[PDB]
Amino acid sequence: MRLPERLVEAIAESIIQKLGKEEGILELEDPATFKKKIISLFKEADREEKELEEKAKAVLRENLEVLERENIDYRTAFLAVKRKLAEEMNINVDRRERLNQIINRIMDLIMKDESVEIYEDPPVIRKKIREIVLGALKIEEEIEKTVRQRIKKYSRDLLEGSPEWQILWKRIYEDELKKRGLA
Numbered sequence: 001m002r003l004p005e006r007l008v009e010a011i012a013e014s015i016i017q018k019l020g021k022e023e024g025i026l027e028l029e030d031p032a033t034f035k036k037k038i039i040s041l042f043k044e045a046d047r048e049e050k051e052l053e054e055k056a057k058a059v060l061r062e063n064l065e066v067l068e069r070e071n072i073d074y075r076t077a078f079l080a081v082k083r084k085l086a087e088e089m090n091i092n093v094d095r096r097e098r099l100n101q102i103i104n105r106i107m108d109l110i111m112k113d114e115s116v117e118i119y120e121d122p123p124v125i126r127k128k129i130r131e132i133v134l135g136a137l138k139i140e141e142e143i144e145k146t147v148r149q150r151i152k153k154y155s156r157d158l159l160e161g162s163p164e165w166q167i168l169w170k171r172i173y174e175d176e177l178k179k180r181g182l183a
Ligand code: NA
Pocket: 068, 069, 070, 071
């Protein structure tokens, strides 16, 4: 589950408020563009995950006879093929390590941006941005936990994991985002 866009926006706003305005270790000429670039970074990371999934599907589609002949469940093969392609594409499949790659890309953006100056050792900036991103991940985890609790109510007449269940999950998720101002 990716971070919703308004939470990604909140990450960027938090970098500006804490590291810029409260601690003064970061200075930016253009906060709105800085936010835009961080949002693009998270969008691009999602585009990479989609490409990985489509590439994994395409590899499986050309090897269906292998799965049948060698008795390899499609679901197991997909996960294994996806992991291998991820290694080749340098995509970490754990959500946390993926976000860590994203923190490095944020640092790359900050350090290569001529309208940005930093008044601390770059790794110090990196660790503070990591704390902020982790904060957003903890919010997303708390939202997801609430969704799971709310959807359990419908266990009696709904198949857990069915397409309807997944759509209902997303509707409850959007409701929770609205209750927190994130949609
Ligand atoms: Na068989």
